[PDB]
Assembly symmetry: C4
Homo-oligomer: 120 residues x 4
């Protein structure tokens, strides 16, 4: 696995059966809420290329650490979207694990190669 | 990991402990209602060879983005089947994540090496 | 990843941070009920060595295919146990995915290197 | 994948997209209640580096084998934390799988390279 620098490199790696890893540097991404400086790595078992213009994936992450309700069982659901221009977003939706009631959501935006890196 | 071109290549890769990845090119698969052109990659953590005649695997994928109920918590359950003649099918069943009620299902059919590719 | 032939090889692979894959050949395994000839491969993301005498792992597998209730959402929970003498067992407990009520269970027994193979 | 000996090695491996494995030797860790000698290996699909000072990850592990309620469906939720001085903790919270009610929790504390090892 190496860094996949370009959108075409990523599309090619998916078409060739490689498992993709997203690495996100939050301080290099823009958000409405302040995000503490962190690096976040996620490797979903599934990923899609939409029309040769978009790469999408998601991850439902179980936690008891979510700020919106510390100590309560929740899923942090993150949707990853990357377009052919290098513009990336991560939208995280916070769900009560027992009921599936939505507690909140927030979004970040980054650029490929900068705040949003992809490996495969 | 390389492309597993024949059914025997795939059975052998399973028998040798390799983790399998399915890459599906939807525009090369037959469906009842047309799906938009997309490439879908999935690596299940489990796989079976039945007899020496079929390979089977499945994935339960959590989503808020399913057309049948956008924004609602759902599981897209996909069952993958591949026979010794190279005929592949993917049956997706859409389930409400909190209740497990079925919301719909649909099926694609593909040919190994054409719309349906396998890596290990 | 190569075949881990001996119990010590497997323990060593775990201690060295390798991810383990179990390949089970059901026809080489003994069970109370008949099992159709199948090869089953599973790679859990967690595994344990108890004392220096047992290796254990498990996998909760979501399905709609289970014989005990075809078409109903279920988890096939498999518990894998391997002792230092090479005696392996897999106990599968079938659970309603919605309620967690137990629908049934079955067990197979195998020998390491024969019906139960391990890779890492 | 090799052993990641220092905190900087681990942070560098995450930042380069490598999937991380935690290997815990319980007998080299300190706990409130003594834990039986076991080696435990876990590979989470996500990990974070907080500031340049902490690495964190978690795993929600389904089991029927938990001492607190043997035979009952449960999630052993383990939160891993490692600081820049090499001090590691694993906090495990035991949850009823159907209801999410907390049944108990316990914690172990270890040192990087001693009881707590990391591979990538």
């Amino acid at each position: 696995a190496v860094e996949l620098n370009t959108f075409q490199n990523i599309v090619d790696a998916i078409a060739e059966g490689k498992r993709i890893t997203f690495v996100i540097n939050l301080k290099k991404c823009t958000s409405e809420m302040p995000l503490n400086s962190a690096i976040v790595s996620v490797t979903p078992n599934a990923v899609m290329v939409i029309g040769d213009s978009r790469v999408t994936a998601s991850d439902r992450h179980f936690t008891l650490d979510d700020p919106l309700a510390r100590g309560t069982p929740m899923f942090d659901y993150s949707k990853f979207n990357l377009d052919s221009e290098g513009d990336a977003s991560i939208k995280t939706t916070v769900l009560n694990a027992s009921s599936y009631e939505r507690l909140g959501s927030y979004q970040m935006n980054c650029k490929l190669g900068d705040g949003f890196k992809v490996f495969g």
